[PDB]
Design an enzyme around this catalytic site. Structure first.
Site, PDB file in Angstrom:
ATOM      1  N   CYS A 150      50.066  -1.430  -1.201  1.00 46.85           N
ATOM      2  CA  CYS A 150      48.811  -2.122  -1.122  1.00 46.85           C
ATOM      3  C   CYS A 150      47.786  -1.824  -2.211  1.00 46.85           C
ATOM      4  O   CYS A 150      46.727  -2.648  -2.216  1.00 46.85           O
ATOM      5  CB  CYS A 150      48.134  -1.851   0.217  1.00 46.85           C
ATOM      6  SG  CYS A 150      48.826  -2.875   1.472  1.00 46.85           S
ATOM      7  N   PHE A 201      50.070  -7.434   8.533  1.00 48.55           N
ATOM      8  CA  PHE A 201      50.739  -7.936   7.332  1.00 48.55           C
ATOM      9  C   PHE A 201      50.900  -9.459   7.339  1.00 48.55           C
ATOM     10  O   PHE A 201      51.182 -10.084   8.374  1.00 48.55           O
ATOM     11  CB  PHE A 201      52.116  -7.294   7.171  1.00 48.55           C
ATOM     12  CG  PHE A 201      52.079  -5.841   6.818  1.00 48.55           C
ATOM     13  CD1 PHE A 201      51.172  -5.365   5.885  1.00 48.55           C
ATOM     14  CD2 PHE A 201      52.999  -4.961   7.361  1.00 48.55           C
ATOM     15  CE1 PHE A 201      51.154  -4.021   5.532  1.00 48.55           C
ATOM     16  CE2 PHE A 201      52.993  -3.630   7.015  1.00 48.55           C
ATOM     17  CZ  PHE A 201      52.066  -3.154   6.102  1.00 48.55           C
ATOM     18  N   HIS A 289      40.257  -3.704  -1.111  1.00 46.79           N
ATOM     19  CA  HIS A 289      41.457  -4.061  -0.384  1.00 46.79           C
ATOM     20  C   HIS A 289      41.181  -3.953   1.110  1.00 46.79           C
ATOM     21  O   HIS A 289      40.851  -2.861   1.593  1.00 46.79           O
ATOM     22  CB  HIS A 289      42.634  -3.170  -0.733  1.00 46.79           C
ATOM     23  CG  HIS A 289      43.839  -3.480   0.082  1.00 46.79           C
ATOM     24  ND1 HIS A 289      44.562  -4.641  -0.088  1.00 46.79           N
ATOM     25  CD2 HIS A 289      44.403  -2.832   1.126  1.00 46.79           C
ATOM     26  CE1 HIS A 289      45.549  -4.674   0.790  1.00 46.79           C
ATOM     27  NE2 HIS A 289      45.474  -3.590   1.540  1.00 46.79           N
ATOM     28  N   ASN A 322      46.526  -9.060   5.863  1.00 50.36           N
ATOM     29  CA  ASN A 322      46.820  -8.048   4.845  1.00 50.36           C
ATOM     30  C   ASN A 322      47.990  -8.537   3.996  1.00 50.36           C
ATOM     31  O   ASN A 322      49.156  -8.295   4.308  1.00 50.36           O
ATOM     32  CB  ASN A 322      47.132  -6.704   5.495  1.00 50.36           C
ATOM     33  CG  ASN A 322      47.390  -5.604   4.468  1.00 50.36           C
ATOM     34  OD1 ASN A 322      47.388  -5.851   3.265  1.00 50.36           O
ATOM     35  ND2 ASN A 322      47.636  -4.387   4.946  1.00 50.36           N
TER      36      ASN A 322
END
Lengths: 376, 376
Positions: A150, A201, A289, A322
């Site tokens: 990530c 995710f 992020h 994500n």
């Protein structure tokens, strides 16, 4: 002549899942409806995720064809590879085509390609596949960044800065492409951390053109990459691990991942901004992020950020989940589009200096210092 | 201020296999002695390989503990990962320690780390493991080059050139570490190309320190990295493939891989050396990835190289086999050591300009132009 972002585009698979409905779907497709307390735990994870929807090339039909992928630890890497290794460059090509169109120059002017994915490894890599799909020059200088998780959306900017600034005339195409094919799996009441991944995710791809010394008659700067740093957090060994196994990519977490990032993030701010004379973290624009909602909440609390600083970051999290390396690039696109639409003075929400954070295994923090571009 | 190689060291696992004896051992350990004609084919592959010995952390004892690795397509990725993910940074640390010792400066002066392996992927990567094993600074700027196969020894030099030249004062540690753990497998008379890998692949690690603007009072240049290019060969799609599967890393070849490289290599020479005014390929020193003996034979024939041009390359192949990305770095070490020992005028066999080739999937040719350093 700083490395300058000249175009950004994104792509997602058409299939979309509404987060409000995901706990019912997930425990049905994995045949785990008897796990009533674990389903409630998962329902709370999904509600707390602050995600509205996620895109996923993994459909119900594909999962029905691949039952070992619906088990927690079913032998399934080959099935995952067969799907993901085609999808990754395919979705990346969709974003790259749009970025090149926005940029407006011939693809023969692309001298370098950086490809980034954690969704599946192969030889030749996704960089080769994308080069052939797009018809880039055979002499394109490729860098294939595999499995860095990530933080790698900032890694590719750190890489692109050195590539473009050391090579006059160079133009770099960056493509990040990520999906849930390696990580989707059924629930286990001894692997709660795996459930967190099932709640967060998502799939997505982002593509950028980056170059030093833009030609103002044909190119339009969006952001300048001023500096790029990487550091490992103290006492954080083992906090996040991902293993590529016969059952696919398994994900392993410790409790206080958000605490490590929030406790250590200001040191990265100090190292990056004190040399520039900057110390007020509300006076810079933010790209963070967002794949861990608790990380953003705790950073905001720790630093005292005004509740709007992380708005574009949390917006991309809400609409897309994500997407691993793709997120920070989606967020940059969101910010510059929103600022143009709202008549802000710069692509950085009216501010001159900005920060972009990547977070991931290590624990690693990637810190990119950006300059915005005026909007007139 | 060109990127300059300042130190090189290598490492191999202690366990060594004599090539003359390998066909007997291999067909015994894989329980395939009834395959008399295939054993003869393999014996000829090994005899033609021009390899005397290879180092291999895979011992008879480990293979006996992992019988699925001795099958052709036994489920075995987890077993391979468990071995290789520890070995890769461990062997890389042995080489890195020696390179840093030769360099003679504190490890705190290492600002960047490039790690390169195709022997197994993990999150965090081997770059993280090496950083912790060596005690590098937590702020070391890492680039993890995974799964790029046999051209990646030149890829890391192409990467290191841009990293060091764009960052004043930077010092880059490069580590390549490769082994046969993902690729070892038993024979199949429908997968002859897999046997080629069993005859050629070996273990090894190489480490370098690279930096622009050397301080002559504390550092000693060996080679300067003048330029670095990468290209895909026409009509070569699918010639070499490697897939990461439940049975490990499977390798797939077409017949005329050497023909593609030899037919196309002079175009890389022309693009790299004509701008410098150089056209006589015997007037430059050579480092050629030697993992395919037929490739070197055919390049030598096609170009009319004197039979000694490739001596250091074939020497490393004889003593170590196809160590993938590590080979070209072993060869550089061999060349500079031999030239010092023999009183040659430069680290490039007395010549001023040199070429270093990486060959691998794509088909990809990496072309690095080197300058030697005088020896006084």
């Amino acid at each position: 002549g700083l490395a300058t972002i000249l175009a950004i585009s994104t792509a997602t698979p058409p299939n979309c899942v509404i987060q409000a409905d995901y706990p019912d779907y997930y425990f049905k497709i994995t045949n785990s409806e008897h796990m009533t307390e674990l389903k409630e735990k998962f329902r709370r994870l999904c509600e707390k995720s602050m995600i509205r929807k996620r895109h996923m090339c993994l459909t119900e039909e594909i999962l029905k064809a691949n039952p070992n992928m619906c088990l927690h630890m079913g032998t399934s890497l080959n099935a995952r590879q067969d799907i993901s290794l085609v999808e990754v460059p395919k979705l990346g090509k969709e974003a790259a085509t749009k970025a090149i169109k926005e940029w407006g120059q011939p693809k023969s002017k692309i001298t370098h390609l950086i490809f980034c994915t954690s969704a599946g490894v192969d030889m030749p890599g996704a960089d080769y596949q994308l080069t052939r799909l797009l018809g880039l020059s055979p002499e394109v200088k490729r860098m294939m960044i595999y499995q860095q998780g990530c933080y790698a959306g900032a890694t590719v900017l750190r890489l692109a800065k050195d590539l473009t600034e050391n090579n006059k005339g160079s133009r770099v195409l960056i493509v990040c492409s990520e999906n849930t094919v390696p990580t989707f799996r059924g629930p286990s009441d001894t692997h709660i951390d795996s459930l967190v991944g099932q709640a967060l995710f998502a799939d997505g791809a982002a593509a950028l053109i980056v170059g030093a010394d833009p030609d103002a008659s044909i190119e339009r700067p969006l952001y300048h990459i001023v500096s790029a740093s990487q550091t490992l957090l103290p006492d954080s060994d083992g906090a996040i691990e991902g293993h590529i196994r016969e059952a696919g990519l398994t994900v392993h977490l410790k409790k206080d991942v958000p605490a490590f990032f929030s406790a250590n993030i200001e040191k990265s701010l100090v190292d990056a901004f004190t040399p520039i004379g900057i110390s007020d973290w509300n006076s810079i624009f933010w790209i963070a992020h967002p794949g861990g909602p608790a990380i953003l909440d705790q950073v905001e609390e720790k630093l005292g950020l005004r509740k709007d600083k992380l708005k574009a970051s949390r917006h991309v999290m809400s609409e897309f989940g994500n997407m691993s390396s793709a997120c920070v690039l989606f967020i940059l696109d969101e910010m510059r589009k929103t600022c143009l639409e709202e008549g802000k003075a710069t692509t950085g929400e009216g501010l001159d200096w900005g920060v972009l954070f990547g977070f991931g295994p290590g624990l690693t923090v990637e810190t990119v210092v950006l300059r915005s571009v005026p909007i007139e």
